[PDB]
Write a protein that binds this ligand. Structure first.
Ligand SMILES: [Mg+2]
Ligand SMILES: [Zn+2]
Ligand SMILES: [Zn+2]
Lengths: 65, 48, 94, 49, 147, 56, 256, 302
């Protein structure tokens, strides 16, 4: 539901640059170039960033207490 | 043996005694479903 | 580190090395292979779960030197090589 | 260890949160009322009982 | 723990191998899963290989690969873009052994495959009874694991 | 004369049952083995006293 | 032993090691991966947690946060790590997003390296308060203690004969991919400092037209860090750990 | 009514008399384990600390059983119950753990935890043949799943795609002896259905054997030593290398495979890799004439 902190393969941190990547993707730019300029070169980290979908915003609306 | 409870919908604190409760509900909004609040005693969770 | 001798012969030494993994085991085995007086030098892990940290080593020499001396020489060679690589790495940046 | 349809997983990947799952089980308790006014009570049972 | 691919390839975890012991490719990629090569051709599962190629292509390019039936991206096109990305057409990569450290004599096929964890976990399936409750009728052990 | 698998299993079971509730071992023991292992070593040493009755 | 540095970045280093064999390179890689110790969150004491994420998920996310390791104070090369505990206290109230930089560390030098790591989103009326206890550990026990990533490849030279058709395409592809290419009057030599794979049209020449040789005792190493330790100090720490392991083995042999 | 209680699959005769639920049994998923022998089964620690073997206290196992009692049920290797000679069963808790241990004597019974070398039954359902259950040896590992050696899988008709297997622990000494002698794994290698090998190598075993024994397959000294150590072979000294390449010795895979076979073994046949019958016919003819062909002569036309 939230972006993982590190890549599952090598442990490279990706949560810092995920929201910038998502914002640039919504602007219409090619996600490959966005990943390239963000330092995400290995396709395992690219797998982690691309395949992740944000869902925590739809879980926060259901309060539990 | 009365205790404080949290409402499911409004979320405000609801106070009632379950031992001698003729009916358990939130008087503020009429909701009949309540949540038991988490205790403030510190709990320790192992990181992975 | 701990050494537990299982079988000892006139030229053979078999021992468990508790607290170690494939890294130092492979390094020591190859360093022993670098020695010409060691006829046989092998290591194994009998189970990657129960005893993944307890490799078993078998060292058989030709009789010129004891297997313990060969293992000590291999460890000293590993230490010297690591020191040389560390010094080269420090000189590379500085 | 991947023989006969088996698979091998990475320890670091598992420790990094890959394929991590949580299992929820829900239990229910009802303060049922019996004949003659007898009913269940929600309280910590005494050791004497 | 039961893990299954989307093409009917299923199995339990055989070993939790540490990352230092796992092999890695020349590009610096350590696989998150290792499957036996014997199961791929016996069950005639080429869609798994096509999905691995498409997943690698999608990860490298950043664009999701369409896998729809009869209108999906052709396999040959996927191999073409994989070649244009700097990788081998077949998806094979030069891998080094994680224990010995030497280069493997065969180029290993590594790609991104969607693997899902199933609810048939070993935590809810392990049962162990020595002695306990018995049936009131036959004086025999009870049914199931809950009791 | 040879011992069948069923006869050998029956002899070992009887010897282990005897050892469990008495019947001191006729041979040395490794100080920690189970009575089944004691019966196995007794059979391996050829010292068992139990015979097999065969119809004739 | 000769060291040649190819690329240096504030989070990574790619270099060439010469004079060492395959077992030594593998041992160095494994020592960097699993033996080099760093600071990671080991335990979490929770006071309040009203977020969507569970306690275990938040604790695991905290464990994945890289923490700076003061290698000067703590002898990271020792076989026994110091039992020092660093407390990072967080007390945040929603709505908003909890970042790694909001943690208040009890030690100045032991702090999260990346202060822009999201942890959890808090809605209105949701608050999160905890104390995370971090201690030194090795990557062989958990992935949270890994200083980063490390790999190496064989330093291989690819000789392409000029009789092979479209050799200029291979030369320009290698030049585009940042590989050192030397040109002679009979063949072209490509130094594979990165992962280089020949196209399908050149696969038929891999036996007699295009050849690949492995430089004996030379490897290309790439080590990337997540900010816990300087990328130059990780190799030195791993080599010192190997030296300490050799000394301990010598001592054990003398005791035996 | 009574007729339906007696008859049917769920009836007393079938569901309660011919077959019934038993005690001291476990059941969980199986995972591969080539590192253990065909005689061994991977028993989880949680399963081992639950299933108990009742061992009578004798003059030779008194110290071991006393240590098991002193360990308790929460420490491995320990014990769960103690039965006096008169016949009262006492469960071992923390309070009476030392008191019962001090009271232990000859004739007492200790329900100790599953230890290494213990004989247990390993059955997979459905049991179509008598080879569907065999008596293995307990190997205790700290994980959760069962572990079974791969060559024993074809007897069980079991893969590792979520297969569930059961384990039965014999209690009486006679049952343990019967399991050890009759239903041991190595005693049922040959299938009685067709008189051929049932416990046999499959898949990766066959592929690795082909890769090792194929023509042109050579290995370095380090690789040969590593595989000898991995296979647990008692090869103290390496054999003479077959050839030297680039100044280093090389060993043929056939030479390494020959160390497995007994020194007095001689057999010739044709395998499934036959597509040039001329060479096979020449080899058969050469064997037929001399009956002891020279190894150099065989290798010339191998
Ligand atoms: Mg199956
Ligand atoms: Zn990655
Ligand atoms: Zn309310």
């Amino acid at each position: 539901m939230i972006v993982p902190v590190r890549c599952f393969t090598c442990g490279k941190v990706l949560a810092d640059k995920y929201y910038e990547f998502k914002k640039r993707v919504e602007a219409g730019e090619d996600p490959g170039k966005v990943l390239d300029d963000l330092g995400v070169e290995r396709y395992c980290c690219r797998r982690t960033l691309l395949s992740h979908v944000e869902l925590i915003d739809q879980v926060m609306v259901y309060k539990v207490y | 043996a009365t205790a404080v409870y949290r409402c499911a919908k409004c979320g405000k604190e609801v106070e009632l005694d379950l031992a001698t409760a003729r009916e358990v509900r939130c008087p503020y909004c009429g909701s009949k479903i309540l949540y038991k609040p988490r205790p403030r005693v510190a709990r320790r969770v192992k990181a992975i | 580190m701990r050494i537990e001798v299982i079988r000892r012969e006139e030229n053979l030494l078999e021992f468990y090395l508790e607290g170690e993994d494939h890294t130092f085991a492979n390094l020591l085995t190859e360093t022993l292979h670098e020695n010409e007086h060691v006829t046989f030098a092998g290591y194994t892990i009998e189970h990657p779960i129960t005893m993944a940290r307890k490799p078993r080593f078998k060292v058989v020499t030709d009789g010129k030197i004891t297997p313990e001396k060969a293992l000590e020489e291999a460890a000293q060679k590993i230490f010297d090589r690591a020191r040389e690589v560390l010094e080269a790495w420090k000189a590379a940046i500085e | 260890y991947n023989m006969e349809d088996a698979v091998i997983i990475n320890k670091a990947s598992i420790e990094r949160g890959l394929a991590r799952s949580t299992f929820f089980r829900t239990y229910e308790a009802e303060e049922k009322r019996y004949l003659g006014g007898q009913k269940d009570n929600f309280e910590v049972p005494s050791p004497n009982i | 723990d039961k893990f299954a691919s989307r093409h009917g390839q299923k199995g339990v975890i055989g070993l939790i191998v540490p990352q230092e012991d796992m092999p890695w490719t020349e590009s610096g990629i350590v696989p998150d899963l290792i499957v036996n090569p014997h199961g791929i051709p016996s069950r005639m599962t080429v869609g798994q290989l096509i999905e691995a190629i498409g997943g690698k292509v999608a990860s490298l390019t950043g664009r999701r690969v369409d896998g729809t039936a009869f209108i999906g991206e052709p396999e040959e096109k996927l191999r073409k873009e994989l070649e244009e990305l700097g990788f081998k057409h077949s998806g094979r990569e030069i891998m080094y052994d994680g224990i010995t450290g030497r280069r493997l004599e065969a180029d290993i096929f590594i790609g991104v495959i969607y693997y899902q964890r199933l609810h048939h976990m070993v935590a809810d399936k392990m049962h162990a009874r020595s002695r306990g409750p018995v049936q009131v009728l036959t004086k025999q052990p009870t049914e199931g694991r809950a009791r | 004369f040879r011992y069948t698998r069923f006869e050998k299993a029956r002899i070992i079971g009887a010897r282990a049952l005897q050892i469990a509730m008495g019947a001191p071992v006729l041979i040395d023991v490794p100080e920690g083995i189970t009575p089944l292992q004691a019966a196995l070593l007794e059979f391996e040493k050829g010292v068992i006293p139990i015979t097999v009755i065969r119809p004739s | 032993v000769e060291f040649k540095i190819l690329e240096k970045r504030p989070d990574s280093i790619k270099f060439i090691v010469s004079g060492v064999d395959v077992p030594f390179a593998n041992a160095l890689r494994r020592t960097i991966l699993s033996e080099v110790p760093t600071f990671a969150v080991d335990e979490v004491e929770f006071l309040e947690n009203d977020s969507a994420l569970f306690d275990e998920i938040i604790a695991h996310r905290l464990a994945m946060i890289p923490l700076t390791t003061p290698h000067e104070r703590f002898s990271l090369d020792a076989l026994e790590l110091d039992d020092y505990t660093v407390t990072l206290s967080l007390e945040a109230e929603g709505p908003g997003m909890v970042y790694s930089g909001d943690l208040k560390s009890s030690d100045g030098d032991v702090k999260p390296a990346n202060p822009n790591i999201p942890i959890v989103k808090l809605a209105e009326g949701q608050r999160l308060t905890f104390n995370a206890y971090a201690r030194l550990g090795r990557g062989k026990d958990h992935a949270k203690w890994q200083p980063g990533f490390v790999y190496y490849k064989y330093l291989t030279k690819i000789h392409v004969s000029k009789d092979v058709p479209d050799w200029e395409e291979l030369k320009e592809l290698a030049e585009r991919r940042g590989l050192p290419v030397e040109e002679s009057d009979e063949e072209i030599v490509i130094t594979t400092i990165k992962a280089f794979y020949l196209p399908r049209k050149f696969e038929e020449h891999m036996g007699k037209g295009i050849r690949e040789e492995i430089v004996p005792g030379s490897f290309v190493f790439t080590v990337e860090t997540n900010g816990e330790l300087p990328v130059e100090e990780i190799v030195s720490i791993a080599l010192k750990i190997l030296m300490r392991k050799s000394d301990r083995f010598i001592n054990e042999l003398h005791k035996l | 009514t009574l007729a339906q209680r007696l008859k049917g699959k769920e009836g007393r005769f079938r569901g309660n008399l011919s077959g019934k639920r038993v005690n001291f049994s476990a059941r969980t998923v199986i995972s591969p384990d080539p590192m253990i022998s065909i005689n061994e089964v991977g028993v989880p620690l949680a399963v081992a600390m639950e299933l108990t073997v009742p061992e009578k206290v004798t003059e030779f196992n008194y110290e071991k059983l006393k240590q098991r009692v002193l360990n308790g049920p929460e420490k491995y290797p320990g014990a769960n119950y103690v039965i006096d000679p008169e016949g009262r069963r006492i469960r071992l808790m923390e309070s009476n753990r030392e008191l019962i241990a001090e009271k232990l004597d000859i004739g007492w019974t200790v329900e100790r935890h599953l230890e290494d070398g213990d004989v247990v039954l390993f059955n997979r359902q459905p049991s179509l043949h008598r080879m569907s259950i065999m008596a293995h040896r307990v190997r205790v590992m700290p994980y959760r799943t069962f572990r079974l050696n791969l060559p024993v899988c074809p007897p069980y008709n079991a893969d590792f795609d979520g297969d569930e297997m059961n384990l039965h622990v014999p209690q009486t000494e006679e049952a343990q002896a019967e399991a050890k002698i009759l239903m041991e794994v190595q005693n049922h290698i040959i299938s009685p259905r067709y008189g051929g090998p049932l416990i046999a190598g499959i898949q990766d075993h066959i592929s690795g054997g082909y890769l090792l024994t194929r023509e042109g397959a050579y290995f370095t000294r380090y690789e040969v030593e590593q595989m000898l150590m991995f296979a647990g072979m008692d090869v103290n000294e390496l054999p003479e290398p077959d050839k030297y390449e680039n100044g280093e010795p090389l060993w043929s895979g056939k030479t390494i495979f020959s160390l497995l076979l007994p020194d007095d073994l001689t057999i010739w046949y044709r395998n499934k890799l036959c597509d040039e019958p001329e060479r096979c016919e020449a080899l058969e003819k050469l064997i037929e004439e001399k009956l002891i062909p020279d190894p150099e002569e065989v290798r010339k036309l191998a």
